[PDB]
Amino acid sequence: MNIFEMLRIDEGLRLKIYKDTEGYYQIGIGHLLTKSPSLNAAKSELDKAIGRNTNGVITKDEAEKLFNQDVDAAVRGILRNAKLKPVYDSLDAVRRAALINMVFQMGETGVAGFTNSLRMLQQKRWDEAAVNLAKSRWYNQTPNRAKRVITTFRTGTWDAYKNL
Ligand SMILES: [Cl-]
Ligand SMILES: [Cl-]
């Protein structure tokens, strides 16, 4: 199991534009297009992303290219983030994947706001950060996903993803 397999599971794969769980426009493997209400604005963003006239549709190959670019950017955002970096540097390989996952989903900014859980993660207080993480809008809006990530942080293994 790896970050790619992990997020593919959590985000799914869709070849047509679609609304995410907050009503935003996305496509591919969790690729956010626009926080705006226009399907047109989204088709515009999409073509610019793809570099061609899509018409709201991309190939698997295309979706995977956005995917690679997005995982890369998440990793680099964490590395450049003064609040995230040290957390990330203190964790083991599985747990780093769980941090990239949250970052991919909600942006560096959003994650950097989990100040208290970040502190516990840094201190290796597993079970307490797990409880802290659960007390969030994030866990309330997408609980199943939140639970897989959170278990990952708790146990340091891929258990929550095996089967899926
Ligand atoms: Cl992009
Ligand atoms: Cl969910």
- For this entry, resolution in Å reads 2.1
Quote the ligand 2 centre to 144 CA distance (angstroms): 4
- Burial zone of 60 (CB within 10 Å; 0-12 exposed, 13-18 middle, 19+ buried): exposed
The span from the CA of 38 to the CA of 34, in Å, is 8
Residue 33 neighbours by CB under 8 Å, 6+ apart: 17, 24, 25, 26, 27, 42, 45, 46, 49
Q: Which two tokens stand for residue 45?
A: 């963003």
Q: Which is the catalytic residue, given 20, 47, 64, 128?
A: 20
Residue 11 falls in the annotated catalytic set: yes
The method of structure determination was X-ray
Domain 1-164 in CATH 1.10.530.40? The answer is yes
Q: Where are the domains of the chain?
A: 1-164
Q: What is the DSSP-derived secondary structure letter of residue 51?
A: T
Distance of CA 8 to the CA centre of its chain: 10
- Residues annotated in a binding site for substrate: 32, 104, 117, 132
Say how far apart CA 153 and CA 88 lie, in whole Å.
12
CA of 82 to the centre of ligand 1 (A): 23
- Which neighbouring-strand residues pair with 25? 19, 34
Coil, strand or helix at 55: coil
Give DSSP secondary structure letters for 104-143: HHHHHHHHHT-HHHHHHHHTT-HHHHHHHHHSSHHHHHSH
CB 12 within 8 A of CB 38: no
